[PDB]
Design a protein around this ligand. Sequence first.
Ligand SMILES: Nc1ncnc2c1ncn2[C@@H]1O[C@H](COP(=O)(O)OP(=O)(O)OP(=O)(O)O)[C@@H](O)[C@H]1O
Ligand SMILES: Nc1ncnc2c1ncn2[C@@H]1O[C@H](COP(=O)(O)OP(=O)(O)OP(=O)(O)O)[C@@H](O)[C@H]1O
Ligand SMILES: Nc1ncnc2c1ncn2[C@@H]1O[C@H](COP(=O)(O)OP(=O)(O)OP(=O)(O)O)[C@@H](O)[C@H]1O
Ligand SMILES: Nc1ncnc2c1ncn2[C@@H]1O[C@H](COP(=O)(O)OP(=O)(O)OP(=O)(O)O)[C@@H](O)[C@H]1O
Ligand SMILES: Nc1ncnc2c1ncn2[C@@H]1O[C@H](COP(=O)(O)OP(=O)(O)O)[C@@H](O)[C@H]1O
Lengths: 47, 428, 217, 529
Amino acid sequence: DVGGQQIFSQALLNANRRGEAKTALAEVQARHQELLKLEKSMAELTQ
Amino acid sequence: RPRSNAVIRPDFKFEDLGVGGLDKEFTKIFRRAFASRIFPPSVIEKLGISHVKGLLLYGPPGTGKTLIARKIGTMLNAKEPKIVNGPEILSKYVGSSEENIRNLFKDAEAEYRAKGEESSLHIIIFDELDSVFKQRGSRGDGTGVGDNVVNQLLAKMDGVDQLNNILVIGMTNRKDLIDSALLRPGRFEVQVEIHLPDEKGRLQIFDIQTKKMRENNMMSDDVNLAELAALTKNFSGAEIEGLVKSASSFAINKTVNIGKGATKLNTKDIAKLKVTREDFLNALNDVTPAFGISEEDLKTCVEGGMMLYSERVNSILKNGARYVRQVRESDKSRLVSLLIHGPAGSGKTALAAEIALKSGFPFIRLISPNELSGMSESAKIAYIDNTFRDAYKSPLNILVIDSLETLVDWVPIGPRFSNNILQMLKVA
Amino acid sequence: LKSSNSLRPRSNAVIRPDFKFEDLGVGGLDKEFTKIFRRAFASRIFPPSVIEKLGISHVKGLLLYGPPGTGKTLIARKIGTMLNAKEPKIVNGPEILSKYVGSSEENIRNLFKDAEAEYRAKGEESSLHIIIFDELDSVFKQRGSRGDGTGVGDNVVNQLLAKMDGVDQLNNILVIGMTNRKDLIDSALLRPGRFEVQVEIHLPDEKGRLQIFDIQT
Amino acid sequence: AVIRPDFKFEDLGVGGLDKEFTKIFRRAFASRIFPPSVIEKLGISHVKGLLLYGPPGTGKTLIARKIGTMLNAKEPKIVNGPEILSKYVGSSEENIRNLFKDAEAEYRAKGEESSLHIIIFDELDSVFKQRGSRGDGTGVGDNVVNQLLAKMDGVDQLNNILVIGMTNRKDLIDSALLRPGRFEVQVEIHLPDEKGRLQIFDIQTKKMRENNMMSDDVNLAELAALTKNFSGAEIEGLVKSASSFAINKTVNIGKGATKLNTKDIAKLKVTREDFLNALNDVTPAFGISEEDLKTCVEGGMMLYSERVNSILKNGARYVRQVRESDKSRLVSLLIHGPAGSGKTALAAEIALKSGFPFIRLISPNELSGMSESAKIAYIDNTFRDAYKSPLNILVIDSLETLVDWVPIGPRFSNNILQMLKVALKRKPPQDRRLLIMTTTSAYSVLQQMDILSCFDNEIAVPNMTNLDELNNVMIESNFLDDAGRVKVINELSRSCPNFNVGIKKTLTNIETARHDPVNELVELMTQSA
Ligand SMILES: Nc1ncnc2c1ncn2[C@@H]1O[C@H](COP(=O)(O)OP(=O)(O)OP(=O)(O)O)[C@@H](O)[C@H]1O
Ligand SMILES: Nc1ncnc2c1ncn2[C@@H]1O[C@H](COP(=O)(O)OP(=O)(O)OP(=O)(O)O)[C@@H](O)[C@H]1O
Ligand SMILES: Nc1ncnc2c1ncn2[C@@H]1O[C@H](COP(=O)(O)OP(=O)(O)OP(=O)(O)O)[C@@H](O)[C@H]1O
Ligand SMILES: Nc1ncnc2c1ncn2[C@@H]1O[C@H](COP(=O)(O)OP(=O)(O)OP(=O)(O)O)[C@@H](O)[C@H]1O
Ligand SMILES: Nc1ncnc2c1ncn2[C@@H]1O[C@H](COP(=O)(O)OP(=O)(O)O)[C@@H](O)[C@H]1O
């Protein structure tokens, strides 16, 4: 035969992407602790 | 006493389901499937058996194999059904099609681990099963996703871990393409065929469809449902609804007068709406069967009309009727074949069609040269074989073959003819 | 507005009362129009109460077939843009297929979502939606036949069948299709509930030629 | 060590497969019984791969499930095939080379003292397909095989790992893994034998019998006999299907309301007719034969004359001869006579009375609608299948029709005829026997084709001619009262004493006359002769 075959295609993500808890967005934990510290200090200052 | 949440309710009747016909399939289904979940757990534990976890419904289009699934899902005091359309699993990223078919069972496993044998039934219904789950081993796409999906479902329905609190329903029109491993007992045990109704089924369906119309004093006193059920010979379950809709459209169009002029809609005209009998007869010219397409041809072959110019005609007709009676009344004579021969132009096909039409058998079919014209040899053989294989369904059947000589392409010059078709017919 | 005691016609009607078949601009075919406008657009004009007391649902399919160069696409265009409904979601013949493994069926799924959302949100007062399939006989062929060696000829048809009449109901759509060959469309797509009304449009009669001539000039 | 000191395999569920268990035990864990010192002294390496395969629903997954607990093994690691694949790049290969870390650590830590770690791959053919599939796409479906092969072949001396792979289709597995050092031993699991069937039935009904829930009437031997080709799963399905009937006599589903007889609940008991109805419901998926022959003799025998008895006795002599002698490894017989005399019924009767393990029938009905090449393949496959069992009977019906003979040409298919001619003379492999019995109605045409030299003996079947035989068939058919049966024969004696009809036509005429006195039956009978 000839020109008797078509083809589909699939896709893989990036390795650098890896997980979802990869800091800069997941380290919002540590940052939240910073923000809570900020909030406590501001509460005192406003008082 | 029954259980705290016994699924199928204490008082339940097949009459309130709302499905006409199929009064034996429902028995079988409920006996095999739901008979063991309304029983004291101690006894079923003593018997040492396990509940079935499969169900398959197959048949031709329009017989009512999706209404049943909906009603089973809605009327059984279980969790909400998990409906999945046919090719809704596939996905782009590698390894995500398989995950989508194992994210359906997670809650069942979550509950079965905690509350043991007191969990509530979980039901998930696959629509158009045969689209994805084909026989693995072919070369369909060039990627290899279908096989993985099939493998995942195989490993999750039985697998190495027990679930015992799940139920899956399937529906399809072609049951010969499903992979074999799915149909083994333990996966899709009970398989049911839903076929076209009989006259009593047609009456039941007609009664079901025209219920609110009657009870709201919106139907004339002239219509006789028995007559209508008798007139619609090969109508399936999904065309009586079309008939009702068409009759209603006819009855409605006499007031609004769509297109000629509006504003005729006034309280007086719409305060006495009533569907008469003439509307149904008019509607019978719009909806037409799809399986009863060969009785019309038989009806057109005696268009010239029968005239009894002599008495031999009466005698032959009586003989044919006698043979019809014999085949109807006997038990061991399951096959009777006749030959009708004579000089050309003597009117044989019309006489045979006349005997056929007065029989009243459920199934009547005709094979004639006109149907096979333009086909190849193999197509003709396949067509004949399929037509013969379609005659082993109904209890009583009539088959008429026209002009045997021309079916094999006989010409006296050679002599030339096709041996294969002759052998096929002789064997059949 | 509010429906008073008097049974007066719907507030946001579809066809309105100021309509006549001489305004469309299609000449010749005249009985076909009567059939089409009785079977399809007659159950959407009566007050909802009586139509609810009859227990009947509206037709959700239309098929037009015929020779080449007769007037099918003109009818589709005129029906689409002379009513009171949402804008049509036009799709050309092979405009659905995509390259990735699971993008074609999704493309067929994305057509119905607005109708689903609005029917779920409101109910029986939802405005009518229209989607028109052009050259229906390009992709939707008989299942299990020769051709479409890749497994796409079957998945697409299954998706459309499952989405037009399924376990979840929907009765605020109207799908209209046009073709030159109705012998290739699947057999499960032409049953009541999917493309009920099928109409053949033939060559014009002499008086039809006169009407067309008067329409053009 | 490697097997628990407290274990005897009698307790475990798997029954009916004992030889396979012994083979597995001998070829798999035997080398790990002695102290290690002997093995190196003997220069023998350990086995690493085991493969199990068979038809769907034979019990392999049961073995896999129970082996870990039965033989004091470390909790086996179970992974379903398609669960390996993942989205991000490099994740899958990592996932494969993340299972072996514990074995490597223990090996490195404790040398040859390391215990045995066993991991079993369910659905092996899912991922490890042929690695030359092609497709021009993401290659994660090839590096997976490469990773496993690297960790299984280039093991760096890991000699404490045993991988078990269960599948249903060996053909789809990549050939690279079927070689020495990688999945060496392959064990096939086939359908059970009758005794294994009894064992399975006992295992399934153990708990039912124990609690006095089964009526004493039920007889497992009869059930084991009836289920001709049922695998284990089908037997379990049958058991619960039969139980559903007993369940459905107190609880009437649908009809009425829920009426639960709290007293009959304590008297719940299964019985035989329930099992027979269950046999009616469930059907096997293998089938082969033992049904076509039974339906072929549905009309039964009549022993209307001595000829039937003599023919049957000759058939019995031939079956005895093929059963006893070891030098006669092939016998062929021809049964020829007038059309409609009744031939296929006699051969089927003899074959059924023979009682051999293997019996089959080839008829044009089966072959109908096929292309010629398909017919040839079918015949060849059928013959090859018949060449298997120690004793075999094969019946060929209406030879002339199998060859498509029509006397106007005369046209016929030469290829099929030649194949049959060559096949009818091929002796079976060593220490196997065959008995071929072929029937025909056109003796002369066969004479013309010159294939009459491949039949050892011929048997004629003359049709009946004496009115006495007609009276016998009439009395056996219960057509009329005694006086009518006498009167018809006296009338027929003078109406037409000379008689040549057959057998089939007689029954047909009897029924037609029953449906519609002398005036019909005798009329038709005289007309036919
Ligand atoms: N007993 C009945 N059998 C069949 N149809 C019925 C019956 N009672 C009512 N109907 C009507 O007929 C329709 C049957 O179509 P249904 O939704 O069951 O699809 P289906 O027959 O399975 O079709 P398909 O195979 O094309 O998906 C129902 O929508 C319902 O309106
Ligand atoms: N007994 C009858 N009395 C009157 N008209 C009859 C009778 N039998 C048949 N006809 C009519 O005469 C015609 C009979 O010819 P028909 O073609 O059916 O038979 P035929 O001889 O098998 O045909 P053909 O000429 O194709 O070989 C039909 O038009 C039929 O309507
Ligand atoms: N009945 C008609 N009245 C007026 N103009 C018409 C009529 N039928 C066709 N035409 C003219 O024909 C032109 C093309 O017709 P149309 O768009 O209906 O093509 P079509 O039938 O869809 O053809 P095809 O099968 O090739 O797709 C229209 O623009 C219009 O000018
Ligand atoms: N000896 C017999 N006693 C009673 N019934 C018999 C006997 N032999 C044959 N029959 C019955 O006669 C019928 C015809 O037998 P069978 O079908 O074998 O015919 P046949 O002559 O081989 O057929 P064919 O003419 O198609 O080659 C069957 O119902 C069979 O049971
Ligand atoms: N000896 C046996 N042979 C076969 N099946 C058995 C046997 N004993 C019990 N069974 C039952 O049959 C099923 C085994 O089938 P299984 O091996 O899981 O199918 P598959 O071969 O596809 O894995 C289980 O339901 C099991 O309880």
